Design a protein around this ligand. Structure first.
Ligand SMILES: CCCCC/C=C/C/C=C/C/C=C/C/C=C/CCCC(=O)O[C@@H](COC(=O)CCCCCCCCCCCCCCCCC)COP(=O)(O)O[C@@H]1[C@H](O)[C@H](O)[C@H](OP(=O)(O)O)[C@@H](OP(=O)(O)O)[C@H]1O
Ligand SMILES: CCCCC/C=C/C/C=C/C/C=C/C/C=C/CCCC(=O)O[C@@H](COC(=O)CCCCCCCCCCCCCCCCC)COP(=O)(O)O[C@@H]1[C@H](O)[C@H](O)[C@H](OP(=O)(O)O)[C@@H](OP(=O)(O)O)[C@H]1O
Ligand SMILES: CCCCC/C=C/C/C=C/C/C=C/C/C=C/CCCC(=O)O[C@@H](COC(=O)CCCCCCCCCCCCCCCCC)COP(=O)(O)O[C@@H]1[C@H](O)[C@H](O)[C@H](OP(=O)(O)O)[C@@H](OP(=O)(O)O)[C@H]1O
Ligand SMILES: CCCCC/C=C/C/C=C/C/C=C/C/C=C/CCCC(=O)O[C@@H](COC(=O)CCCCCCCCCCCCCCCCC)COP(=O)(O)O[C@@H]1[C@H](O)[C@H](O)[C@H](OP(=O)(O)O)[C@@H](OP(=O)(O)O)[C@H]1O
Lengths: 386, 386, 386, 386
């Protein structure tokens, strides 16, 4: 009736994987497959998150708007502006060590920033930023899930972003879209962003939906962003459109019915900053990106021993010495693996210095909350990671 | 104030990718990176979808239940049973050629099946199956998105599954969870399934939510499935729990409050079939899997020229000759690439023989609908793919 | 005048090799680069040397010739016949373990053979064979120096071959030509032999010069052998010509002046044996090659524990199980490396069981002489290598 | 009796090589395996030969000695000095294109030099140098046969070196020893030289034998050179000893019987030049090596279009731009392969511009003789290779 077996037995009745194939078929026995330093950029991922604050003026602008509709327009413009720096940025930020931290104080911009690499398996980065004029709280946690297949590498920054406007007693939450790096095998590396972003005003019911459109057939929808701002009863109040690599516009639904085409009567929500001319000769950094890993004058007395400005492999790549930056990275990672074994032979879990596990008080999703008192600078009992 | 440049220029001011690194650093210039045949299994992905019909008795059982609650219990058991065959199945089914088809008629099981490889970039497989006693319609489309990173390969079978119970004038829709293949680099290849499945009864409002739990820390939640069946007003009517590698149980919410632990008063929704003893020596096939690629007596007169039973590379691997199966696969793929160029130089799009693009009439999601009249067997104007 | 420096410093002022390039540029860190078992053949190199005895009838023929001229004709035919088995033999014999031995007794052919793997760094194989009728002694040592570049792999069997004709009180010495394996990268693997061989009769002054011609432009000289036999005063007495893959002819210098063209009046010195029809399905073995690794009935009681008939990885490949033959080879080599470390931590040199270092008593070249008393079979104090 | 077959058929009855294994087992299909530019040095092999003239003062010294014994002492010192520059030189000179040339005129040293890359398959470099005071002719041809196995790469500079002392009407011929580059896989790259060199005075019968000793067990014979100068009747007249990385001494055989130990009464034949302090930061070049690829002021009017000072890939590496030097090398080689195809489709052989095939008039060995009239600079009808 129906056959019960295959004509011949399996060609190889052995447990075979990649490492087994390389050992038996070719002569290569492998001991480690890691990320070569060439694909990196002189930048910690903790500092990559700090680039969200480049457009902090949109938070200042949202904090001084009277009504919730105009605040969401600036909150949506800020969330879109946070991903704009990825354009032509094909270098991968360094995977930060467990216990790594980064602080940034900018009096001229009205915020102080603190981030900590809170986990390694999986890599989790918790960040907190508060306004220096009692205006906003900006915090969250990022698990960057990298996925690769074909010609492209997807990077999904999983985690909840939280923006708390103090002077209005409200909070916004959303998630960043997926970043895609094409032509990683052959061709010119180029960046794309797609996904759906939903910003929720947790005391007014306002919700802003943003569709980062993937480039369709032949790429006619490249970088296009289209969305809307609805109220609590799903009534659309505002139409949003543009490109995250250029500008973001807004218009009322009445005029909506009546190479970004710009409808008359629309108002600008955000426009991308022009990059400095030395950007391409600088890993495509922005002006705000170069200031991130700068060791300020007299900063040796205030920084904790876990600030990535002290990290040598990033500093070595920044100075152009790949030879020792590759060896320092290998030295730092072996020390991190070595420190893990000792923490396992004594059955002791790793302690986070500045953030603690908890639930986001607006969505219930597990999050990494800021514990406070980082800037009183009690920097004993810190990890020795460098 | 803040520095405006990096101390040294970029180490390499050249557009570098993987192919460039291999060419300049090592001596290897590459022309093609494809999937080696060793990781494959003597099975088309069109036939991999046909394994959903192994537990068609659960559809027969659901079709003869009077009330919608008991039908959803068998529909949920059927959807869970469709993924059960993945256990210890670490071989990859062949990527079917554009225009490839597969039919399966089983009078003893009460269904006839037809699938067609409707696209190649991206790979899309449309399938349709109807009951031989005017009882059920089972169709859908699958885009298997493979994603790899670290030690594991994720496979997300994107697409909407549709089950139409004719004698009850209702339809169910859901999506299959993500399959994960661990230890693809080194170690023992093993399978896991996680995600959230939602089955929707489109005329009663009944919704069954199923959580394929990922194995947590140390793997205490391995293969566990937990869910519930709620009515139109989100009132939970039934509690579901078990393992997709063993059995699936059900219980009412009253007794719920009052190594699968089995609560007294629960009833079995589904139990996995035992595999034949020659399974491990058979690419871990089930009894239903071996019958898929069998060329029946006299089948040469009814099959179309695009049925994967006629496909030579699968047949060569099935007979144990990797040498010609690898060459036949390379021959078939070059012919498919060659056929694409001619279709491009004449500016002619590819025509699908048995399925057509459309919208699913229950969710509005773009789908691939069955056009009918496959089994009248008018097999001229078919593609020449072998 | 003349510049004293280069315009720019070195691109990389680091000590870089192959292992460093793979680690820094690609993600691969290597721990071992060895010979994959696919290129091997079910045959120890100790048994590869035993194939010299396939044409022992030419030694029997030389031993029963009255005059030294006709004996050199058969000694030259024997030396040429020893390399004839390489034709279409592109599999590499197993690198024998330190202390490995191989014996072959053939009463029907009139010789008993013994070989021992006397060194590993470098690999040296010493062999001795004596006639069972007090007629000849045949011994020597082989260091196979493998050299690779481009498309081909050269194999130079360094070492002095010694043939002692007892009933004539004379000895012959010579060296085998270089074997070349073409198209090891891409194309069809094929064998070639080139070099100059000089056979010296140590009590008559007779010298036979043989030129294994390399295939010239377009390969018109493929496999051609041309030489002569001169007396003590360099007077040429005999002309030799033919192909080592077919036949070897001889003619006097008078008729020489007056697709092997065969001059009338020439006489055949040697003709190659026809291979059995199952040769190509047998790693291109000869009939004499298959009998080498055969475990005779009752041979378990006479063999030493170091005879490669007991070697499991060769036996596993011979039975068609590459899976365990590759693992047994890896197991045997680790044990050999492990045994070397213990011999180093106790500052003890390795002892050879059956051969001892010495000088060849006919050329003064360092050689490996046979110590005798192998066939009294005192097989305690043998190495444990398997 | 003796078995006639193997228990199981061959594991793979397919023609398999390296390229086939990589394609079937791994996913890599290769199209070209070449030498990566990292292992190179800013230096053509034609210029590598010119470094023989660094110690031309030893030829001047030999030309002004009255007796043949003292001339051979300086000829032997010159031949040893020609290989001394290899110490710590682990970079490979560029493989020169077919038709490439290099000239060097040094009035202050008393010679003009000309070399031409006379072949490509195999690579052959013919060089000629004559004294500017009618004193010496120095010419020859070099086929550098590179052979690799294990941890080391051997380089045998095959070819006959010829030194003609005009004012004494005699000629010397010899061959350079084999160069070995250890630890090319892992470890520190270091250089060794071994072999036997025989210098023959073709009108006096004087012969100087030089043994470049390979480093023995633990390397106690590293770089040691030991030899002697015998007359026509093999009577040893002079004893030579030292290291080719330091100094070379000489002593009469009487005092010979009666960390280089220096016997009292010995006289210095040659001492190595000290390298400039910037040598290690200069690919370990000597002072004479940097002047080789220098484009002199006004040299644009006298050089032929085939002088490697005009070669761009060497110039690009010399300026520190590996990016375009690798692309220029790939561009130059494709043009050379392209030029070969056209020369084949018209059935036209390649013409050598300045050297012609012939026999060395002192040994009869096939050589490449200098045709003269290079320095009349009739540089039309030259190849277009750049
Ligand atoms: C343009 C980019 C292509 C190269 C991909 C770049 C590959 C990544 C390169 C990594 C560096 C060196 C590789 C060394 C690793 C050895 C493993 C080789 C695996 C293979 O390498 O990796 C893939 C791309 O997926 C990757 O990520 C695979 C990542 C796997 C990493 C190791 C994991 C184990 C290997 C396989 C996993 C087995 C588990 C699967 C089980 C799942 C079900 C249970 C080949 O792709 P695929 O299977 O989809 O093959 C198409 C197809 O053959 C089609 O038919 C097109 O045909 P068509 O368009 O001509 O019509 C083609 O097009 P094309 O190559 O001409 O461009 C081409 O795309
Ligand atoms: C157990 C499996 C590990 C091997 C991964 C297996 C890798 C796949 C093997 C393919 C076959 C041969 C590879 C040939 C291809 C050459 C490219 C090499 C890329 C690399 O190979 O691929 C990865 C795994 O992601 C892969 O898929 C990468 C796929 C990329 C394919 C080619 C695409 C271009 C290459 C990079 C893309 C650059 C674009 C990125 C841009 C994104 C932002 C804009 C290394 O991983 P990673 O970056 O996360 O490195 C950790 C880390 O170093 C950690 O620190 C742990 O440290 P720790 O646990 O010791 O604490 C470690 O652990 P471990 O290795 O000891 O196990 C280890 O996991
Ligand atoms: C047909 C076979 C070619 C492939 C060789 C096959 C290479 C072996 C394959 C091994 C498996 C995978 C390789 C992975 C190892 C990475 C190292 C890559 C080194 C390279 O791979 O290895 C060679 C062949 O020498 C080998 O053995 C090298 C063995 C080295 C092994 C590792 C040792 C370190 C690497 C270099 C040593 C550096 C030390 C040198 C110092 C000496 C002086 C002090 C390329 O050859 P080469 O330098 O002579 O390059 C010509 C040339 O470029 C010409 O110009 C023709 O040009 P043309 O005829 O077109 O006119 C071309 O012809 P073609 O390739 O089109 O056929 C082609 O032959
Ligand atoms: C230190 C350097 C070792 C790595 C060699 C470096 C290898 C070159 C690396 C190239 C770059 C990447 C390789 C990719 C190419 C794939 C082919 C792999 C072939 C293999 O790779 O290449 C060799 C070294 O010969 C090479 O040149 C081979 C060049 C071949 C190139 C491609 C040609 C086809 C491949 C094989 C040719 C088949 C034809 C043979 C036929 C001849 C007879 C008719 C392994 O050596 P081998 O056979 O002698 O193996 C010993 C042994 O296993 C011993 O037993 C020691 O044992 P023990 O000392 O522990 O006692 C060990 O010692 P160790 O490795 O621990 O150091 C170790 O040396």
């Amino acid at each position: 009736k129906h056959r019960t077996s295959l004509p011949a037995p399996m060609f190889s009745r052995s447990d075979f994987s990649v490492w087994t194939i390389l050992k038996k078929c070719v002569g290569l026995e492998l001991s480690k497959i890691t990320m070569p330093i060439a694909f990196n950029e002189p930048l910690s991922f903790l500092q990559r998150i700090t680039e969200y604050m480049e457009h902090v003026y949109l938070i200042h602008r949202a904090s001084c708007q009277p009504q919730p509709l105009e605040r969401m327009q600036s909150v949506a413009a800020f969330a879109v502006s946070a991903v704009a720096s990825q354009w032509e940025r094909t270098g991968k930020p360094f995977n930060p060590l467990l216990g790594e931290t980064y602080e940034l104080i900018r009096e001229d911009l009205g915020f102080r920033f603190i981030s900590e690499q809170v986990s390694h398996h999986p890599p989790i980065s918790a960040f907190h930023s508060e306004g220096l004029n009692h205006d906003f709280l900006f915090h969250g946690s990022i698990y960057p899930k990298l996925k690769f297949w074909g010609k492209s590498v997807e990077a999904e920054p999983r985690g909840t972003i939280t923006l708390e406007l103090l002077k209005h007693n409200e909070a916004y939450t959303w998630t960043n879209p997926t970043c895609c790096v094409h032509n990683v095998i052959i061709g010119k590396l180029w960046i794309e962003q797609y996904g759906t972003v939903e910003i929720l005003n947790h005391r007014t019911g306002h919700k802003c939906v943003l569709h980062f459109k993937p480039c369709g057939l032949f790429g006619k929808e490249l970088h296009k962003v289209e969305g809307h701002i609805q109220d609590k009863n799903k009534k659309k109040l505002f139409m949003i459109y543009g490109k995250w690599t250029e500008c973001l516009w807004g218009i009322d639904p009445v005029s909506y019915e009546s190479t970004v085409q710009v409808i008359p009567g629309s108002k600008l929500l955000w426009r991308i900053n022009t990059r400095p001319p030395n950007s391409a000769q600088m890993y495509n950094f922005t002006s705000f990106t170069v200031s991130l890993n700068e060791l300020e004058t007299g900063m040796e007395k205030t920084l904790p021993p876990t600030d990535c400005r002290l990290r040598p492999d990033i500093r070595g790549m920044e100075n152009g010495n790949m030879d020792l930056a590759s060896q320092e990275k290998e030295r730092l990672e072996e020390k991190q693996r070595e420190a893990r074994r000792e923490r396992a032979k004594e059955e002791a879990e790793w302690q986070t210095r500045w953030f603690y596990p908890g639930n986001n008080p607006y969505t219930g999703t597990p999050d990494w909350l800021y514990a406070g008192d980082y800037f009183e600078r009690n920097f004993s009992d810190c990890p020795d990671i460098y």
